[PDB]
Design a protein around this ligand. Structure first.
Ligand SMILES: COc1ccc(NC(=O)CN)cc1
Lengths: 245, 178
């Protein structure tokens, strides 16, 4: 992550991020709505960061320092470039919505009143098809990535030294290779939880309540489609085991 | 320090997310209670042994039968949660959660945890449950379910007051070490 966005999302909540004299000007319901919207953007910022650790720290580090067999790095980090593209674009949209809402003379005081339309756009049309295709491929390659990781760590000395070196810093404590893969797989099922709670506090404007209800429906349709498109790949699985599923 | 992995399972309203949040912060948040939990690696010392215990939640995965099992690989200990204010969450333990965890995590110890124990003597909870001919889960009902499903043990806690929270995670660490 970049320092500017890290500082903007350093506080535990929107109510602790904004100036107290700005907080005091809003009703309790607005603060409750803004605290959950802040959590959605803060967790999206962290999820994009998880994907950068996978692409730049792990994947690129292995290509530039190790002599792994071709197709091994792809097997460890399936679809990471596509995932990074989808979420970096989504994060850019969320951060621009916050930036446009800042008060003049402030880099921290804002209120996001119109999130629903952005969520409908993200979870419909081509961007939704790309998310469905990418997570169906990623989640079907999840178990294979973990087993390939475990094999390499146990049998390859230079691979083990590389892993131990780049994961030693305290800021990587929660972000080992297997942890990053599960963090990515679990990301998509966090969205309905966050959207339902934002909706709970968005009844003040009927257009917004309707848009968030539509977005919630679209996320659920996407999740059902991904869930139905998963079948775990296994290295060395025979055709007979596959067609006898 | 040895690395161990813990996963919490249970129904949507069982309090699993709040339990992980309170333990990882060592506090019930006074300003904002997070909606979700990403992951955490706790430094725990139990009975003289240092362990790095990675914590994972299954919240949001309850309706997705092919995404949810992806949380289980290499799990060392399962916390199987129910809410004491929800006798219905206890009834889903033996024939939904238990056969699933036994299939994907064979031989992994399961600790059955009764969450929200503070609601057992809450009058609003007792009134609401009495409308559906129900009462808060009794300690013996929790112990008997844990005995029946082959759980390693039975424990109770309150994420709201922190009572019993540290003990659940210290015991889970001991189960993961066996
Ligand atoms: C949702 O995913 C599954 C959950 C359980 C099973 N198998 C059994 O529970 C066997 N008693 C298989 C798949």
């Amino acid at each position: 992550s970049m320092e500017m966005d890290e500082k903007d999302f350093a506080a535990d909540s929107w109510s602790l991020a904004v100036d107290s004299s700005f907080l005091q000007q809003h009703k309790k319901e607005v603060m409750k709505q803004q605290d959950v919207i802040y959590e959605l953007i803060q967790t999206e910022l962290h999820h994009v960061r998880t994907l950068k650790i996978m692409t730049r720290l792990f994947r690129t580090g292995m290509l530039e320092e190790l002599h792994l067999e071709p197709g091994v790095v792809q097997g460890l980090f399936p679809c990471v470039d596509e995932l990074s593209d989808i979420h970096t674009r989504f994060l850019s949209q969320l951060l621009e919505r916050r930036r446009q809402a800042l008060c003049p003379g402030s880099t921290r005081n804002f209120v996001i009143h119109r999130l629903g339309d952005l969520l409908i756009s993200q979870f419909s049309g081509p961007s939704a098809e790309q998310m469905c295709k990418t997570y169906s491929e990623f989640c079907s390659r999840h178990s294979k990535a973990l087993k390939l990781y475990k094999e390499l760590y146990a049998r390859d000395k230079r691979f083990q030294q590389f892993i131990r070196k780049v994961t030693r810093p305290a800021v990587l404590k929660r972000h080992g290779v297997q942890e990053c893969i599960l963090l990515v797989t679990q990301r998509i099922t966090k969205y309905p939880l966050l959207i339902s709670r934002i909706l709970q506090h968005s009844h003040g404007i009927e257009e917004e309540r309707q848009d968030l209800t539509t977005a919630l429906g679209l996320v659920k349709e996407l999740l059902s489609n991904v869930d139905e498109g998963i079948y775990q790949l296994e290295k060395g699985a025979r055709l007979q085991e596959i067609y006898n599923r | 320090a040895i690395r161990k992995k813990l996963v919490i399972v249970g129904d949507g309203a069982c309090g699993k997310t709040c339990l992980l949040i309170v333990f990882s912060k060592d506090q019930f948040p006074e300003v904002y209670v997070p909606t979700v939990f990403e992951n955490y690696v706790a430094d725990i010392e139990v009975d003289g042994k240092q362990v790095e215990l990675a914590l994972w939640d299954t919240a949001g995965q309850e309706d997705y039968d092919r995404l949810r099992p992806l949380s289980y690989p290499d799990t060392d200990v399962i916390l199987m949660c129910f809410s004491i204010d929800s006798p219905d969450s206890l009834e889903n333990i033996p024939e939904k959660w238990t056969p699933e965890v036994k299939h994907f995590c064979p031989n992994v110890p399961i600790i059955l945890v009764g969450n929200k124990k503070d609601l057992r003597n809450d009058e609003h909870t007792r009134r609401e449950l009495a409308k559906m001919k129900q009462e808060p889960v009794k300690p013996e009902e929790g112990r008997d379910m844990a005995n029946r499903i082959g759980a390693f043990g039975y424990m109770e806690c309150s994420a709201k007051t922190k009572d019993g929270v540290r003990e659940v995670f210290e015991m889970a660490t001991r189960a993961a070490l066996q």
